[PDB]
Amino acid sequence: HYEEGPGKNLPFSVENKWRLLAMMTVYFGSGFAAPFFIVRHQLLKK
Amino acid sequence: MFINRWLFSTNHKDIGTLYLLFGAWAGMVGTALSILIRAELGQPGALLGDDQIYNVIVTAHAFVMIFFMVMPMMIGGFGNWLVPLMIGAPDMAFPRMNNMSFWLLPPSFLLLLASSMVEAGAGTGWTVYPPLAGNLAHAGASVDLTIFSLHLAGVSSILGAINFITTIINMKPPAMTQYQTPLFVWSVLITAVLLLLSLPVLAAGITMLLTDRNLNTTFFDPAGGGDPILYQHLFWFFGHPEVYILILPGFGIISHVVTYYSGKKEPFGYMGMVWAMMSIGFLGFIVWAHHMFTVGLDVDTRAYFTSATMIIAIPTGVKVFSWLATLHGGNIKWSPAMLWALGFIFLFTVGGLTGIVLSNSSLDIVLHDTYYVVAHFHYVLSMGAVFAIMAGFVHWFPLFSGFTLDDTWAKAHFAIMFVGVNMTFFPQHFLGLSGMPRRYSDYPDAYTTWNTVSSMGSFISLTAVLIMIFMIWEAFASKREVMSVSYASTNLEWLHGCPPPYHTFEEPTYVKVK
Amino acid sequence: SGGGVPTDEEQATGLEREIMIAAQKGLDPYNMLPPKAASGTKEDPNLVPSISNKRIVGCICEEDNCTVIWFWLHKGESQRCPNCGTHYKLVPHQM
Amino acid sequence: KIKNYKTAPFDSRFPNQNQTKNCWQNYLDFHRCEKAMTAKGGDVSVCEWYRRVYKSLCPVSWVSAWDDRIAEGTFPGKI
Amino acid sequence: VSAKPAKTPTSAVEQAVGISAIVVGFMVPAGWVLAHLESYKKS
Amino acid sequence: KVPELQKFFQKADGVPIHLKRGLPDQMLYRTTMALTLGGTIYCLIALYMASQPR
Amino acid sequence: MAYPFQLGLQDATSPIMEELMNFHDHTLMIVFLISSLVLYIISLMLTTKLTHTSTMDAQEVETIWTILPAVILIMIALPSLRILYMMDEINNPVLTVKTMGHQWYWSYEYTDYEDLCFDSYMIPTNDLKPGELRLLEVDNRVVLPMELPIRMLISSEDVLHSWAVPSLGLKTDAIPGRLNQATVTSNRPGLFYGQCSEICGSNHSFMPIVLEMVPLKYFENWSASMI
Amino acid sequence: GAGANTWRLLTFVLALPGVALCSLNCWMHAGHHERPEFIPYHHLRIRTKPFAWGDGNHTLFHNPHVNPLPTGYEH
Amino acid sequence: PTIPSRLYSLLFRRTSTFALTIAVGALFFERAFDQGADAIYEHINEGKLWKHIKHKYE
Amino acid sequence: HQTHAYHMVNPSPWPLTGAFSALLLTSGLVMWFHYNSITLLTLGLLTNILTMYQWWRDVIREGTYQGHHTPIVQKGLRYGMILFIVSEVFFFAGFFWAFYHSSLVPTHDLGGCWPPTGISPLNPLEVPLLNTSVLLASGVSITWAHHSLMEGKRNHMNQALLITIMLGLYFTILQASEYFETSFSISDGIYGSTFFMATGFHGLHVIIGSTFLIVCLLRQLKFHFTSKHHFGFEAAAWYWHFVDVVWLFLYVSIYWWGS
Numbered sequence A: 001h002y003e004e005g006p007g008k009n010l011p012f013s014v015e016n017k018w019r020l021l022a023m024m025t026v027y028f029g030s031g032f033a034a035p036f037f038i039v040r041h042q043l044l045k046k
Numbered sequence B: 001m002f003i004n005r006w007l008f009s010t011n012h013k014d015i016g017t018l019y020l021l022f023g024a025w026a027g028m029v030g031t032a033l034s035i036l037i038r039a040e041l042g043q044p045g046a047l048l049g050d051d052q053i054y055n056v057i058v059t060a061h062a063f064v065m066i067f068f069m070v071m072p073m074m075i076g077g078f079g080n081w082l083v084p085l086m087i088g089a090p091d092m093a094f095p096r097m098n099n100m101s102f103w104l105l106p107p108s109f110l111l112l113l114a115s116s117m118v119e120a121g122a123g124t125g126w127t128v129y130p131p132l133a134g135n136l137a138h139a140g141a142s143v144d145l146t147i148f149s150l151h152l153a154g155v156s157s158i159l160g161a162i163n164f165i166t167t168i169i170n171m172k173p174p175a176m177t178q179y180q181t182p183l184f185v186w187s188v189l190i191t192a193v194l195l196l197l198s199l200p201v202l203a204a205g206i207t208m209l210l211t212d213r214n215l216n217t218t219f220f221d222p223a224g225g226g227d228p229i230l231y232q233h234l235f236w237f238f239g240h241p242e243v244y245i246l247i248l249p250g251f252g253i254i255s256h257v258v259t260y261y262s263g264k265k266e267p268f269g270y271m272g273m274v275w276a277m278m279s280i281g282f283l284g285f286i287v288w289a290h291h292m293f294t295v296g297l298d299v300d301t302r303a304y305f306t307s308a309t310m311i312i313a314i315p316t317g318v319k320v321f322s323w324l325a326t327l328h329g330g331n332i333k334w335s336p337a338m339l340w341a342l343g344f345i346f347l348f349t350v351g352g353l354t355g356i357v358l359s360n361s362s363l364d365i366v367l368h369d370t371y372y373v374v375a376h377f378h379y380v381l382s383m384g385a386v387f388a389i390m391a392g393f394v395h396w397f398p399l400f401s402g403f404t405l406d407d408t409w410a411k412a413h414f415a416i417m418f419v420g421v422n423m424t425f426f427p428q429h430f431l432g433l434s435g436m437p438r439r440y441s442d443y444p445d446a447y448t449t450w451n452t453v454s455s456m457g458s459f460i461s462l463t464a465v466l467i468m469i470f471m472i473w474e475a476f477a478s479k480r481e482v483m484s485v486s487y488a489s490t491n492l493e494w495l496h497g498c499p500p501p502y503h504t505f506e507e508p509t510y511v512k513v514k
Numbered sequence C: 001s002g003g004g005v006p007t008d009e010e011q012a013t014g015l016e017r018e019i020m021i022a023a024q025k026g027l028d029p030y031n032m033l034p035p036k037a038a039s040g041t042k043e044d045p046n047l048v049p050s051i052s053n054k055r056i057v058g059c060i061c062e063e064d065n066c067t068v069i070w071f072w073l074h075k076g077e078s079q080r081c082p083n084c085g086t087h088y089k090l091v092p093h094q095m
Numbered sequence D: 001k002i003k004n005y006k007t008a009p010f011d012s013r014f015p016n017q018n019q020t021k022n023c024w025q026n027y028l029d030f031h032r033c034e035k036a037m038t039a040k041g042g043d044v045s046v047c048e049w050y051r052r053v054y055k056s057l058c059p060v061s062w063v064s065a066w067d068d069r070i071a072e073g074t075f076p077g078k079i
Numbered sequence E: 001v002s003a004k005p006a007k008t009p010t011s012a013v014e015q016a017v018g019i020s021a022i023v024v025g026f027m028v029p030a031g032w033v034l035a036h037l038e039s040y041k042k043s
Numbered sequence F: 001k002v003p004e005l006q007k008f009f010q011k012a013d014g015v016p017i018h019l020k021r022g023l024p025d026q027m028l029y030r031t032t033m034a035l036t037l038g039g040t041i042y043c044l045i046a047l048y049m050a051s052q053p054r
Numbered sequence G: 001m002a003y004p005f006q007l008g009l010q011d012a013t014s015p016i017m018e019e020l021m022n023f024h025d026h027t028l029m030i031v032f033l034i035s036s037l038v039l040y041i042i043s044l045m046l047t048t049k050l051t052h053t054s055t056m057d058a059q060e061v062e063t064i065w066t067i068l069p070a071v072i073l074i075m076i077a078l079p080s081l082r083i084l085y086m087m088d089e090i091n092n093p094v095l096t097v098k099t100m101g102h103q104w105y106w107s108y109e110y111t112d113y114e115d116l117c118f119d120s121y122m123i124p125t126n127d128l129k130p131g132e133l134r135l136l137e138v139d140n141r142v143v144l145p146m147e148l149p150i151r152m153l154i155s156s157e158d159v160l161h162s163w164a165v166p167s168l169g170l171k172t173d174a175i176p177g178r179l180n181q182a183t184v185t186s187n188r189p190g191l192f193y194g195q196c197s198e199i200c201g202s203n204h205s206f207m208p209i210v211l212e213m214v215p216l217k218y219f220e221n222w223s224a225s226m227i
Numbered sequence H: 001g002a003g004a005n006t007w008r009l010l011t012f013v014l015a016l017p018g019v020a021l022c023s024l025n026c027w028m029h030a031g032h033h034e035r036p037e038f039i040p041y042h043h044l045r046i047r048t049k050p051f052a053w054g055d056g057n058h059t060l061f062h063n064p065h066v067n068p069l070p071t072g073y074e075h
Numbered sequence I: 001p002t003i004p005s006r007l008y009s010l011l012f013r014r015t016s017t018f019a020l021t022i023a024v025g026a027l028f029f030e031r032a033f034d035q036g037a038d039a040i041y042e043h044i045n046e047g048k049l050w051k052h053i054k055h056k057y058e
Numbered sequence J: 001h002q003t004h005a006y007h008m009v010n011p012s013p014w015p016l017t018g019a020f021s022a023l024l025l026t027s028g029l030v031m032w033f034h035y036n037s038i039t040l041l042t043l044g045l046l047t048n049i050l051t052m053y054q055w056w057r058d059v060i061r062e063g064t065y066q067g068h069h070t071p072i073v074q075k076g077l078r079y080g081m082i083l084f085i086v087s088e089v090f091f092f093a094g095f096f097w098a099f100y101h102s103s104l105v106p107t108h109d110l111g112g113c114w115p116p117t118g119i120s121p122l123n124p125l126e127v128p129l130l131n132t133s134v135l136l137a138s139g140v141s142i143t144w145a146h147h148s149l150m151e152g153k154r155n156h157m158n159q160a161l162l163i164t165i166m167l168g169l170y171f172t173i174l175q176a177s178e179y180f181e182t183s184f185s186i187s188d189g190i191y192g193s194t195f196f197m198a199t200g201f202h203g204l205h206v207i208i209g210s211t212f213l214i215v216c217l218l219r220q221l222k223f224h225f226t227s228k229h230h231f232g233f234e235a236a237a238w239y240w241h242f243v244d245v246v247w248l249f250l251y252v253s254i255y256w257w258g259s
């Protein structure tokens, strides 16, 4: 049977707060920093 | 096990949680794109050199946060999280097709990013007006990837709309009729109907554009008998129904938030609300040429379309009056969702009223493709639907996850977001009235000051979104679960507990015999 | 010509087979029809079957109403819809 | 005659916003005059003002392209 | 929605370093790109 | 051929619907996911060489 | 022709767009009235102390709620169509001017008689005459007369441009294969500015339109001494 | 009339004899005239892009006897 | 009231009506069959028969 | 245990597999159009053919081999099929309205005449009238097959559905014949573009309908459709009547009127 509960209906690990902070900041920072890398690559290309 | 849950999913709650994750990712992507766009209009300069890459950034902003923030989060996440839970259905009628729609979304995101990646760039605005999007001004593989991204997003939205319509009409308890469902279910009913009655024109138009680019046809080349105004007609015949897609589940969420924390057991004038929303969903298809009052139409056509634009203006006013009359003498509790709702009502009202100012064709002759238009729709979209989605997420986050956000931090987020977005989008009224056109990387000196003010306001909104991650981290930094939920009787979604288990409605609801 | 196309009293298997078998007896244990025996009286409540000791009960307790009053119903004594007065008693003997 | 002409007048045939059909029909019935006075042998400059009005109406690129398609005998217009 | 108190407490100092870590992690690649564009323009 | 297939497909085993036949369903599942992930990786490599100009 | 801290419209020269200003002020009355009304209601009935959560009556306020926004929108729409049916009257075209939107620049044709056409480029920032403007200067200006109904026939080659001047209240999209007719009347001489109002690629922010309008004796002395 | 037999009759009397009659009639009409004179208008036989299959100038269902090429006919 | 019942009833049931059906069908079949076979024969021999070349020699 | 009467589905992979196969198909079109590669496109085609194959093999497995298809699930299926069919009605309405916009006001580069000068359309009396007769005869054939399913006679509906599939294949092969023997190409003006694009999607849709009829025929030869629960042929008949009414609209709008 599947596992249900608070934090157990999420794909990411919940039980450790600091690795959660690290993974959320790298995930949202990668999302934030993707268009900067795109625009610097078209600056480098042209 | 992990793959069989989060990749092979066949229940609506986990799939909706994945829409929350993907929509949050795309929201930060488009937030960064908006930071760039306001970032070199603070000071007049070619910070990015040519403005082809600026148009690439603007097109990316528009596409990712129309089709990749607001539609996934709103439609997919809130429908898959709430529509089975309000109506009592255990699941959707077609869960595998819903999962295919969700998993079709990240290839569309990947092809949009790859469309931005190619050195020509798809810098042609949100509308894909040919032959700027043709094979001579945009000779490359980028806009073909943009078209295929729109194909994947449209097919995912069509499959989701099919599942939504069949699970509202068919997956309902038997003695409950259509006029006992909560108003968010009606919102996604008319919304999914307009998706399925709008997206085939978009798909046909962009298939036509792809065939014009590659297979040497001339639907949009006037040298072989085509007409670009055919694309304008087809695109906006899709587009204003898509506009009311972007606004109508926001109306449903706002109605639930307003009737919830005010203590009302029943929103005022339910049949009036339902009539107004079906009136919007019926009048959304005959109004589209208000986007083309400067193209060269016949004057009788323009008079008819501005008349029909006021006829679509009246039921929205009926809805906002019924909101102010379902606040009538209620036990109001100042949760942050009410702060988002009051911000929605006032700022969506002023944005829509500037839309009514833009509606008259004679004034739209001079106020076309200026920042007055940008102020109108950035009000309505960028904070009406935005504050509706934060009202919904802050309200249903104990239901979604289990833990609660801090009320002080959420009200501080409302304050910083309110100040930021109002400072960003207030002075561009005066910019557009002064005559500053849209899609401009650099401007003359006289448009400088308001631009600078608005740009630093955007940075304020940037600070706002930081607090968002912080306060959701604060939830997982506190693990504070709920005691109980108020007004649990009139809402079925709160009544299975926070958060609901994997299999809800194992034995379904019991209906009154009458 | 021929026969060949089968009558669905033989090719019905599984959940389709028991819903057709029960439905042509007139009993619906899989919630396909609106139930009967409306009585909000104290001595004669609304009887609702169950397989667990807990069930959703919705009350559209006055005719042509917007909101359905949703509440959990538990095994034991019958308590009413919390605004109108229609009784509800759960009987957990339906598998 | 009408001439002492200054600028092409407002035609009642096309009162609306789009006026490409005006110069299209004007170039067409200019050539309809041209072959009409060719066929009947009349004076060709009786409807002289048609060239003045289609040079006043539609741009030089379109009339240059149309005259080039006359010059190679490849104009789909009814002439 | 009435909430139970926190099963894990959160003091001021870990909140402060959390918001500091979030802002520096969000601003160091964005500020890395925007801190220098003369190198990306091949000037 | 249908009623013995009805009796077969009500195994009450817990094996999922895509693996109800057993060995050839397992083989077909493996060969429809392995080359699909290979095609996905090939698509990412294809877009990566498409991104860098010549 | 903008100026810093401008909140309202660009000031009037054409009668069509000063009537547009009159209608703009009237609809600004309307939006101020209803925005102040909803602001007063929002700041009012959120600031009460009493509660009323009964099953109130519904069908007793909809007659005013239906007829009053219709009344407001019809007093909005009567001057709308009144001025909309006044920009398309019986034309008396003293002058016809064609323009055709080249790839990030313009061309203008004065060929009613004695054929004249020119291509208008942009003055660069580093090539500016002192005292001039940034992003709003053109070497070859568009010369028009005053007090006269003049038509613009617009077109383009490939991409969708838009000939737009807000001070005169003109904005029409330059489309290939379709010339559009836009009337213009001016009551003052001078130099009136506008920009592109449709996207046209990698220099879309870099084409201005400038209208120098002068009396007619300088038209003989100018068009007779230009080619 | 609650019967498949009227549709059976309607297939075997109206539908299949009708399609047989129009098939034979199209075989009577199966005579095609000679090709038109190659006049190169610029509003057709256009190439805004080389084609993505083979030569780049042949269409997908190209036939060399009725379908021209922008260079002209080919023999 | 179905179509094969009424087609049997008012056309095939009586023998005199059967013979009237046969005679009228014979006349219409003669005309249609003559047209069809003549058209097939002139298509197979396109340009070969005398009526195809009759117009050249007036 | 499930007490309600709905369908609970096992966790299936082919949503993800089909979505990534669609990614492979779109990228295959991109690289064939711009880089001349076929292998990735054929990989995407192979992936989504077997994906669709075993997804609907699964749907067959709960339908006729497990019997989870409750009548309310049948109502959901017929609602979804009606929604899908009005989706392509409105899709082809977009194509139609593009054709009417191109046709009713011709531009100055066509000569202002429909059809334009230099393009000679075939008159609709010989071949497209034959197409309309084929599709109408197939409509009477599927109505006969549906009513034979109503009565429950096997060999008659077998013959009817063989006739339907035979005329569907006859339709697509002689449509390929008129593609072979037309006087103009897809690059030959706006008339050629509109006509070939509309007829191309109609040919694609009738190929989908013929394949769906082949699938339901092979299902019925394996004794799947009963006298009441035979939703596969109901969806086949609905799609086929859709193809018939769409072809009637192409016959009127493109062939007979305006040409």
Ligand code: HEA
Pocket (backbone or CB within 6 Å): B127, B243, B244, B246, B247, B290, B291, B309, B312, B313, B316, B317, B318, B320, B348, B349, B350, B351, B352, B353, B355, B356, B358, B359, B360, B364, B367, B368, B369, B370, B373, B377, B380, B381, G034, G038, G068, G069, G070, G072, G073
């Ligand atoms: C959700 C998004 C949203 C919403 C609701 C609207 C709503 C409206 N929009 Fe807009 N619109 C857009 C998104 C939206 N729009 C976008 C994205 C574009 C540009 C796309 C592009 O960039 O090309 C656009 C463009 C656009 C234009 C084109 C301007 C131009 O490009 O030149 C016009 C003009 O007709 C217009 C009009 C309207 C009108 C009249 C309404 C109305 O529905 C507003 C009604 C709302 C109200 C709140 C009514 C207020 C009424 C009361 C408060 C009651 C009292 C009233 C009386 C007493 C009368 N919109």
Ligand code: HEA
Pocket (backbone or CB within 6 Å): B023, B024, B025, B027, B028, B031, B034, B037, B038, B058, B059, B061, B062, B065, B066, B070, B124, B125, B126, B127, B374, B378, B381, B382, B383, B386, B389, B390, B393, B421, B424, B437, B438, B439, B440, B441, B458, B461, B465, B468
């Ligand atoms: C979804 C629609 C949407 C939204 C929200 C926005 C939001 C914003 N837009 Fe956008 N904009 C468009 C749609 C939108 N815009 C379109 C369609 C165009 C025209 C494109 C074209 O030219 O064709 C446009 C054009 C446009 C321009 C035109 C560029 C130019 O004319 O030169 C500019 C610049 O001022 C701009 C700025 C902004 C800013 C500063 C915001 C800010 O509001 C951004 C701040 C928003 C957020 C921070 C969202 C909150 C997100 C989160 C909280 C993360 C998600 C997580 C959870 C919800 C849990 N927009």
Ligand code: CUA
Pocket (backbone or CB within 6 Å): G101, G104, G105, G160, G161, G162, G196, G197, G198, G199, G200, G201, G203, G204, G205, G207
């Ligand atoms: Cu020309 Cu923008």
Ligand SMILES: [Cu+2]
Pocket (backbone or CB within 6 Å): B239, B240, B243, B287, B288, B290, B291
């Ligand atoms: Cu619109």
Ligand SMILES: [Mg+2]
Pocket (backbone or CB within 6 Å): B294, B368, B369, G162, G173, G197, G198
């Ligand atoms: Mg425009």
Ligand code: NA
Pocket (backbone or CB within 6 Å): B040, B041, B043, B044, B045, B046, B047, B441, B442
């Ligand atoms: Na800039």
Ligand SMILES: [Zn+2]
Pocket (backbone or CB within 6 Å): C059, C060, C061, C062, C069, C081, C082, C083, C084, C085, C086
């Ligand atoms: Zn009750």
